[PDB]
Design an enzyme around this catalytic site. Sequence first.
Site, PDB file in Angstrom:
ATOM      1  N   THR A 303       0.804  -1.215   0.000  1.00 52.58           N
ATOM      2  CA  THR A 303       0.000   0.000   0.000  1.00 52.58           C
ATOM      3  C   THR A 303       0.848   1.281   0.000  1.00 52.58           C
ATOM      4  O   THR A 303       0.470   2.284  -0.611  1.00 52.58           O
ATOM      5  CB  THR A 303      -0.967  -0.001   1.206  1.00 52.58           C
ATOM      6  OG1 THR A 303      -0.250  -0.403   2.384  1.00 52.58           O
ATOM      7  CG2 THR A 303      -2.111  -0.973   0.958  1.00 52.58           C
ATOM      8  N   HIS A 340      -6.898 -14.804  -1.096  1.00 51.22           N
ATOM      9  CA  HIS A 340      -6.782 -15.757  -2.191  1.00 51.22           C
ATOM     10  C   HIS A 340      -8.145 -15.954  -2.821  1.00 51.22           C
ATOM     11  O   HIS A 340      -8.375 -15.582  -3.971  1.00 51.22           O
ATOM     12  CB  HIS A 340      -6.246 -17.096  -1.681  1.00 51.22           C
ATOM     13  CG  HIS A 340      -5.911 -18.068  -2.767  1.00 51.22           C
ATOM     14  ND1 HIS A 340      -6.858 -18.570  -3.635  1.00 51.22           N
ATOM     15  CD2 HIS A 340      -4.736 -18.641  -3.121  1.00 51.22           C
ATOM     16  CE1 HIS A 340      -6.280 -19.405  -4.478  1.00 51.22           C
ATOM     17  NE2 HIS A 340      -4.991 -19.465  -4.189  1.00 51.22           N
TER      18      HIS A 340
END
Length: 1199
Positions: A303, A340
């Site tokens: 980020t 995932h």
Amino acid sequence: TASLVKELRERTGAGMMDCKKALTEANGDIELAIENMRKSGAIKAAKKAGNVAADGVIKTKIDGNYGIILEVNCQTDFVAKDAGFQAFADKVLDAAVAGKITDVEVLKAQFEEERVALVAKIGENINIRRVAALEGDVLGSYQHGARIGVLVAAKGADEELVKHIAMHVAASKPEFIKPEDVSAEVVEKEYQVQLDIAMQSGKPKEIAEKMVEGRMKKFTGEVSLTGQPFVMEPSKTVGQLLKEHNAEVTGFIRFEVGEGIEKVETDFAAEVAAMSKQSHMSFERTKPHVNVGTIGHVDHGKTTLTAAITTVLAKTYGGTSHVEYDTPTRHYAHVDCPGHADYVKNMITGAAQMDGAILVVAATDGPMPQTREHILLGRQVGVPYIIVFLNKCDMVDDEELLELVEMEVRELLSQYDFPGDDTPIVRGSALKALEGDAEWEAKILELAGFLDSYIPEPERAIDKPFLLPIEDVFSISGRGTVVTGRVERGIIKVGEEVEIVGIKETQKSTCTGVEMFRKLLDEGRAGENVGVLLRGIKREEIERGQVLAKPGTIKPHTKFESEVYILSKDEGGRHTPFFKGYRPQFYFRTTDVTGTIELPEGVEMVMPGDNIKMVVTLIHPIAMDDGLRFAIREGGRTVGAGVVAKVLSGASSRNSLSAQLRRAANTRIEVEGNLALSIANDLLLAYGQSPFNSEAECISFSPRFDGTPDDFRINYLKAEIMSKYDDFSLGIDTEAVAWEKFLAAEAECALTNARLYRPDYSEDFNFSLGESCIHMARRKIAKLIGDVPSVEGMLRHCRFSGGATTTNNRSYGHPSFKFALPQACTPRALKYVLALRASTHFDIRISDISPFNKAVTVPKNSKTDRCIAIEPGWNMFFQLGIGGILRDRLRCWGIDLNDQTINQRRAHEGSVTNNLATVDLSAASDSISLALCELLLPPGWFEVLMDLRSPKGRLPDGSVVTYEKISSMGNGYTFELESLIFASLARSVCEILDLDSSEVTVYGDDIILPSCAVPALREVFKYVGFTTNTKKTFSEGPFRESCGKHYYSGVDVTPFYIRHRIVSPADLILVLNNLYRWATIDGVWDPRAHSVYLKYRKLLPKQLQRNTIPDGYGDGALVGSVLINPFAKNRGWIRYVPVITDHTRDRERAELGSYLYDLFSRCLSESNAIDQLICRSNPTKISRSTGKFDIQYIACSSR
Ligand SMILES: [Mg+2]
């Protein structure tokens, strides 16, 4: 030294700058540094528990008949399924069974040491939260991947039974095991609190009482494993499924990972945007749109790096929650993969695919244990190219520790078949580059440097081997068979050789031309909505669904293996799981095709809201190749979508039931007298209400506007209900009344055309409220409108449609019979059509050419028929032209006409609030005088209006009238006009009174404006013409009505109407249903009516009283529960129920006007979950519907 901080890093799992920095503290000692890191390692953990741990797995073990289940949490999906996190949560499950631990604290501190032995190596808040255990006689378990786990003890059953009742609890969340376990206090008070829900609404004690309880009875019934329809045979509750088998369940325990925890929602876009809000405080559209994704460890800075890319590529170059940034050569779209599974979903659904990942690891720690799980997610989705960013490198004084971390990651890659040796790995800091530092700035550009070359350009859509999903086939006379589609990819140059492959033995042919509606081309280009001319191929040798592709390009198959996401409840998918024998439709770019699916190795159930890899085998072939998306469909509705990976090699209903119903359905129910009129009185009686005395009354009864709400809602339904019954004998009443009415529509209209040209009061004193508003009106109006209808908006907003044109009739209504047969034309309007013709190569014929439309008679009430207008069909093409622009514009005044919801809403605010009033207009569309018209309109408009308008009219009576009104209802714009005309007019009353113009919202002659504004709008309307309905305009009742919703002090008091003499079973089945909706509060009857309903339900053919459908699925059956349907057969996991259709014989469409219709559309469409995209709008078929009925099997779900 470096070569020896790796022996200590590869024996711990801890960080690289926590391995070289704790090693300088042991002066250089191996077992010393490891033991020092040990104890200094629980501060890490404690530093961690300030983060939210939301994900994680669930675990279950049973010993003969003693079982247990515990959910241990992490904070990231990826971790939950890692090599290590399973080994820990498997030991804390094995040692919980033997050494049986119910009390939680026991093992949380008995492991507590080894629990900081992970948080250290991994760096995620991992807290083994709640655990419990259950024991019964035969207790079974079910495990759904690992996200949710059930523990069911059932003293009296076998193994197949508990497996299945573990699965029903697994997928149904029963809070209690039986409807009696109810907290006798949680119920003695939620019934003493819902007892007002209806006791205030005015209902008499014993109704609220019985109602609350019928309700409260289901409140319980459903949320209890007893009254929960079994999940593999929903047609029966587990209540009976259990009692019918020998058993009974002693108890159950169902944990779902994450339940209860909040985990506040994350937003990757603003979060990186507000993060660099600190460092923000220091012709070429042809560039490829390659999007990428950052994947890695939660706080290794995916980020803070995704921030540096953006600002550093901002001070260096030009310009589904995806942040985006530029490069000289191409344009990038970036996404983060914090999950995932959650990713897979996005890639299957198509909300964001990926061309090239970018694994972000921080060199402070090197790879984590679960960075393989990252590289994994990328291998599975089969992401082509990955680039690794090594973050925060400033914090490594030793440069040999970097080619060590590089070493570690560069192999984790090749354990997963990515070029682990040859891949780019850039070494820099994401944060030093935020602080405008040039030496760590250019390592960012170094990555975006690789974005340009290593992530290869995606093949442009117009570069692939031609394809076009055939959406329709017409047999054009003199011009040979033709398909219409949008070219998916590639090019087709008139005269090349195509194939038509898919559903039938793949055939071939050749292109004899390419044309649009406007210009006729010689080649189709990917992205265009073209039609394509063929030869040597008839029109029944083709089906909507097969593809038009260059030969060899693509081949038909029936068996493939794919990976799909099936929609959750919320997302409007199934609300019920399915299993081994799912047999749905599979929508391929243009058509449904039924199929059969086989789950993989282990999955036996599938739940609304999970992912899945499955083997689809359809009935007939379809042309395809890998990368192709297909929607999973169910009798019309999408409940999934999925993509195609590997093309494998490709290897009920009844006679007299479908037919036994058909009979019934067709039967004519029969009775002495007026059936409706009796169904009324028996309901009036049911509610204590002096019933109708004569047919005379049904329509001459006027509500009282006091009583409790309930005391009204009935009396209201009483005044209305019958009102519009067409069949009342008792009546000197006709439609001659209808014309008598429309004949003063003119006589008035005249007087106002006169009035409106002459106001000069001989002096100066006189100023009237009328003049003024029309003066404000004209101005306001013009500001919004334009000086004259542009053409850019005349050509997207003109369209055929509907039914009656002076040339066509109800039966030849469909727009293709408007291109099929040559349509009338007002003299004036001519030009337009010529201008149309001047812009297409197809021949815009016109039949006659009169200034005449047709005035007619359509039943509407019992006390009057209705006057309407069947216009010249070319006028209407254009009358809907400006219709649709008066639409687009009326939005700036906050008016939306597609939406009569933002007009009923307020009707209801007004009934509590008493501030907005509802007005209602009598002679609505039939009194808009030409006078008033130009006074308010830009003349540029008021002309193109007098043009398209119909000037004279032809009666039935053979006689003529020339129009005083500027339009009559049924004129292609007479709606969007009268709206705007009334809106402006009110909006100007508004100003004259210091009220908010913002408060006037409108739709037809249904206006809503603030209550004070009303008395002027009366004098203002009185003046301009309109004659207002004092009776049905409420500026002060407890009551407002607007757009079909009526309202009493904030409750709904809309009735339902008995429109026709009821004689068919389809007919009764309706009434009974609208009585159902009118008196249910969510499936629960009001007794007073549930009596009259029941009674009259027995007039039906028997089979038809038990045939029931949910709500809003038709009126071809009785609304009720579908699990109680005896006819309802669950095929292939999808519950097909049967309903009454209207019967229709097929008719023949004009292959040309049906063809012109299709291509004019591609044009209009060209001038305009996340899964509507793999869906179209369909071909044209005709039919005249016989009076006979028919039975159709559809698709259902229980709620
Ligand atoms: Mg109205």
